[PDB]
Each structure stands twice: as structure tokens, then as C-alpha cells.
Amino acid sequence: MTTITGVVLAGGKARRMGGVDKGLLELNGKPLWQHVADALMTQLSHVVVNANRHQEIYQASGLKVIEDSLADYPGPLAGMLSVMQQEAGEWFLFCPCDTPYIPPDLAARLNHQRKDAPVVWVHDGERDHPTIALVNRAIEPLLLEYLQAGERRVMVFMRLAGGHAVDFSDHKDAFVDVNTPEELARWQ
Ligand SMILES: [Li+]
């Protein structure tokens, strides 16, 4: 019913008994994934989270938790596909669980700059963030074919799908990512 579903990508696998659950690390008392979810809810009515560990903890804030298919495909594309297979609706705005400062015009600017492409993603002036991506439904069969072929590379896929980068270089620091607990400590 709404146009774009927001999706927080809070990782798959647990390729050694998980280890650190990055989405649940807390920034000012609030799990990183929830910072992302709250920022997406500012701009979108329907937001879900892809998480494959500690699902009960993710389920605590009342959002739908989507788990990866048993295919166990590699990398962030696997979560994107699992969500498209389990959610209706024509557009998805994906964002990883570690970029807590994403801006309230993320969806609007990506949509304004889509210019007929089926996929666009954020470029922050220094690097591509191909997992912060507005993706049309039509990408679902292409993703499934790519992952079934044994591929994993995210940027390569986004290029094959006919996507382009959208320039968010004017958004100072909105796309900083917190990759480690060590990094997290610096933003408290
Ligand atoms: Li554990």
C-alpha cells in the first residue's frame, strides 16, 4: 500500500557462532539498528528489519523481523533478496544497521534522482554505499539469478542491474558507519 518499504539490514550468517551482533551494539542507550530504523520511520511508514540472530531481541521494538532463506547466500545481497521474497510492494530502501545518522531526505533524494533507473544508491563524496539503495521489485529475479550463480559482489550487481550513484556529498557525515565497537566508542 505505501510506495517504498524501509529495510534495516542487520546482517546474516553467524559464520562462527555469531560473535558480536553489531546491530545490537548501543549508541547512547539505543541499539544501532534502532537508530537506523527510527531514521527510516521519519521518512517512511513501513519499516522492517532483516536479522538472522537474536531475533527475539530485534522483535522487541514492534517491527517485523525477516530472516534469510536457508539457501545461505553470501553477503548483503542475500538479505535484500530474502526481504523482497517476504515483502510485497514495489520499492525498497535498504540501509545497513551501522549508519545511524542517515538523513530525513534519504528516500526523497534517491527517488528524485532515480531518473528511470531501477536501482540507485548513495555516494557520500568519498565512497559508494551500495547497500544504502532504493531498489525496484524488478530487481528480484536478477538478484535471485545472480546469487544462484554463486556470485556475491554488491557493487558489481548494482552495476549489472543498471543502477547509478546519487550524490549526497553535501550531507556532512550523515553516512558515517560504525563498523566496530572501537568505532562506536568514538561517537558516544
Ligand atoms: Li550469543
Swiss-Prot record:
Its EC number is 2.7.7.77. Gene3D superfamilies: Spore Coat Polysaccharide Biosynthesis Protein SpsA, Chain A. Changing residue 98 to N: Marked reduction in catalytic activity. Still capable of interacting with both MoeA and MobB. It comes from the Bacteria. It is found in: Cytoplasm. Disruption phenotype: Cells lacking this gene are chlorate-resistant, fail to synthesize MGD and accumulate elevated quantities of MPT. Its main location: cytoplasm. GTP binds at residues 9-11, 22, 50, 68, 98. GO terms for molecular function: GTP binding; magnesium ion binding; molybdenum cofactor guanylyltransferase activity; nucleotidyltransferase activity. Both divalent cations appear to be equally efficient in an vitro reconstitution assay. Changing residue 22 to A: Marked reduction in catalytic activity. Still capable of interacting with both MoeA and MobB. Induction: Is expressed at very low levels under both aerobic and anaerobic growth conditions. Keywords: Cytoplasm, GTP-binding, Magnesium, Manganese, Metal-binding, Molybdenum cofactor biosynthesis, Nucleotide-binding, Transferase. Monomer. An equilibrium exists between a monomeric and oligomeric form of the enzyme, which could be an octamer; whether this oligomeric arrangement is of functional relevance is unclear. Interacts with MoeA and MobB in vivo. Transfers a GMP moiety from GTP to Mo-molybdopterin (Mo-MPT) cofactor (Moco or molybdenum cofactor) to form Mo-molybdopterin guanine dinucleotide (Mo-MGD) cofactor. Is also involved in the biosynthesis of the bis-MGD form of the Moco cofactor (Mo-bisMGD) in which the metal is symmetrically ligated by the dithiolene groups of two MGD molecules. Is necessary and sufficient for the in vitro activation of the DMSOR molybdoenzyme that uses the Mo-bisMGD form of molybdenum cofactor, which implies formation and efficient insertion of the cofactor into the enzyme without the need of a chaperone. Belongs to the MobA family. This is Molybdenum cofactor guanylyltransferase. It comes from Escherichia coli (strain K12).
